[PDB]
Paper text:
For this, the size-exclusion-purified assembled complex containing Cas7, Cas8g and Csb2 in the presence of a 72 nt crRNA was used for the structure determination. Seven interlocking Cas7 subunits which form a crescent shaped structure bound to 42 nt of the crRNA that threads through the interlocking Cas7 subunits were clearly visualised in the CryoEM density. We built the individual Cas7 subunits using the AF2 predicted structure as a starting model. As observed for other type I complexes, each of the Cas7 subunits occupies 6 nucleotides of the crRNA with a recurring periodic pattern of 5 + 1 nt, with the sixth base flipped out in the opposite direction to the remaining five. A beta hairpin emanating from the adjacent Cas7 subunit is positioned along the phosphate backbone of the sixth base, generating the kink. We can also trace the 5′-handle of the crRNA, which loops back and is not bound by the Cas7.1 subunit. With seven Cas7 backbone subunits, the type I-G effector shows pronounced curvature of the crRNA, reminiscent of that seen for type I-F systems.
The unique Csb2 subunit processes pre-crRNA, remaining bound to the 3′ end of the mature crRNA, and seven Cas7 subunits form the backbone of the effector. Cas3 associates stably with the effector complex via the Cas8g subunit and is important for target DNA recognition. Structural analysis by cryo-Electron Microscopy reveals a strikingly curved backbone conformation with Cas8g spanning the belly of the structure.
Author numbering:
A (entry chain F), B (entry chain E), C (entry chain D): 1 to 316
The structure:
């Protein structure tokens, strides 16, 4: 199955998914720590809502590839390089796919003993001072992390070139709602106040309120930066690998990732491409069938480090 | 069509372009160091925001025309003069096009090797007393690098005739959003949720606030000062060269700098011209074809220094 | 229309022109760093800003005519009296029309040898004692420098009658903006060298701040006191000449001084007269045609000294 030729010169891939609630007619947006529901006024003079940020979408698209039941990739993706962190007793604390800021985690790259630290220093020493090459950085990163190449990292740690080394996203997505109405609701924790009726110790009839939103058009947008992955220039095998991996993430999220929140019950009504016009998207079973071959090819080209999975122990 | 009729008709060239966000309805403007988003109140009585600084637009219009990996211009521009800065180990640490201070860059004119310093002093000695001839300076800049002619230079060095010499930029451009509106959305760290929130160790939890804007009209403005370059009087063919170089830079940025921040991604809806009225801008393929011949013509006029490329070594 | 009808009638001529920025809304006003932008509160309580100083508007009105490469007046103004200072080599250091203090300077009337010093002293000896007469000084200036009459002079040298002689400006103009709102901005000087960001040596990142302004009403005022020149009484033909010259200088400044600074790029929209009311100002082509004939007439009266151009050298 050929897909990279149809995406070998186009600068970016745009995909748009039309969502609808599974049951009822309402949904719950993300509770930002300051404002809660981040509603805003649209350019056309109509109310709009950021259903959830372009970060939560990324963390979900990143979880749908991992399996905590084994602390390893799902079988189709098995073999992709990843650093995994163990405690002093050998039980797995965390791995770089679940961490937030990748190799910049405080568990990773910082601790009592640091193998991956000396690896990163040995790799990037030539660029630690002066001009930085995003190709030499992207290859060093792909050596030890197979998906950060889609989400970026900031090597803030001062001893690593003062934090000069940086790399932005290549895949991004978010959900947006048009013409949002509001519904309001609340309740009271009506525990009987016969033995105690003071809220200080949690008794009483304490009330609460919460808001709910109604929108006739919710959209999930996905954007893939083909130009930058070409600008890495690691090889057409790597390019087709990363395109297939991104399509895989999107399909799995779209099929069974749409319970974003307890009251956020969502369904997919139709996916379509926006740019390039007239293209066709692979099916999920076809990506499942292709992925292990493309990963094998890239492993045979030696771009991955060996062993693919690398282990580090965390303690102060 | 040929471009010299415009060099006869008018004193200045004015263009504007309608930008639209590629997806969604909101974007990330520049974060200025002192204040963040540079919003202000408009004379018409409506709020608006400066998307980015005009000198950042200049650095981008320069970036879209040079390849640091190859250490040479894009194919149409090749052969134009430039100075490359060498490291003691022979690897090119930078060049005066990549750097933003052009000849004034502290790595240039400084260190144990300063051949370009004398190549300027040879005529700065004439400029030391009495008046200053802008056409003579513009000639000696065209002799060294045709980009400085386009973006201006200040020769602050005391030995360089007391730092008397300056030249304002002929091409200027900026983007601003009218009637802007605000959409705020913060976030929090996922990782390290279970352990203590000791932010000062780095081993902690951190929430943050983030803000992005909405606008019904974003425009990029481009201004080319024909009067000043004409008042250099270096020729007509050199004027054709500079106007082609500028209009190529515009078209070559209009399809590359469409994204400026990782969350700020736009596309051009249309391009329009203001001064002169009724003129039609040439296509990018036409400039691509014409430009090498104009460069060779001006080289045949003997304006460029020989060799066109200059090498200088920097140590400190 | 002829000029002398209004000169016989009215004591002063008042005109105003309302400006706009050609692109965008912001502009850069004058920047005396001991104050920065000069802002103040108006009579009606509104905030106010003088955009350009009157003395600098005058220096521009005197720099718009004359030509540096031709080293002489523009063709319409050609033939009017002037003095230029030559160096030892023989290339003119200082035309007097360009210089700040006009007929008073360390270059003219000061130096190892000086002819013009005696030429003025002879004509001012009878003004050394008793009351000074404006008519005699105005005659002497009109024979030596026909433009210094409109801008005024102060002969501070104690050798010239203790410096008692002085003459106020006849033409005054300035640019003023009303109901101003500020628009702050900034930037950073980036760097990419290997060793260190020593700002004391010019390396490393260095931020900076700048302030721009906007206004819904900005205009330039012009004032010419016909009473003052009528009080000089050099003649009706001389008055007609000076009125033509002033009008011409304004009508050309309006299409050559708009680019006051690198970031201002103003643009005139309309021009209106305030006193005399009901008058119609001439067009630029008419003054451009008429002016040489009036210079011929006044030369025929013998008011201009012969040779019209005075040559003098300077040596310490």
């Amino acid at each position: 199955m050929k897909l990279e030729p149809l995406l070998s010169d186009v600068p970016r891939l745009l995909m748009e998914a039309d969502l609808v609630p599974v049951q009822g007619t309402r949904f719950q947006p993300t509770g930002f720590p300051d404002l809660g529901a981040a509603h805003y006024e649209g350019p056309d003079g109509r109310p709009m809502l950021l259903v959830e940020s372009a970060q939560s979408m990324a963390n979900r698209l990143e979880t749908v590839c991992w399996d905590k039941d084994a602390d390893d990739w799902v079988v189709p993706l098995r073999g992709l390089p990843v650093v995994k962190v163990l405690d002093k007793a050998g039980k797995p604390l965390t791995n770089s796919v679940l961490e937030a800021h990748r190799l910049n985690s405080p568990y990773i790259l910082e601790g009592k003993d640091k193998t991956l630290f000396d690896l990163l220093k040995q790799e990037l020493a030539h660029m630690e001072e002066g001009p930085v090459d995003i190709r030499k950085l992207a290859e060093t990163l792909l050596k030890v992390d197979a998906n950060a190449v889609l989400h970026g990292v900031f090597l803030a740690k001062k001893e690593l070139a003062g934090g000069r080394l940086r790399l932005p996203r290549a895949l991004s997505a978010f959900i947006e709602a048009e013409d949002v109405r509001v519904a309001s609701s609340g309740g009271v924790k009506n525990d009987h106040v016969n033995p105690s009726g003071d809220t200080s110790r949690g008794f009483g009839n304490v009330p609460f309120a919460r808001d709910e939103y109604v929108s006739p058009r919710i959209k999930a947008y996905f954007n893939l930066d083909l130009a930058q992955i070409r600008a890495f220039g690691l090889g057409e095998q790597v390019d087709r690998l990363l395109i297939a991996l991104a399509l895989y993430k999107v399909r799995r999220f779209l099929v069974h990732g749409l319970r974003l929140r307890t009251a956020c019950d969502l369904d997919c009504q139709a996916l379509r491409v926006t740019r390039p016009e007239g293209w066709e998207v692979p099916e999920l079973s076809e990506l499942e069938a292709a992925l292990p071959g493309l990963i094998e090819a890239v492993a045979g080209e030696g771009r991955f480090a060996q062993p693919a999975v690398t282990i580090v122990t965390y303690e102060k």
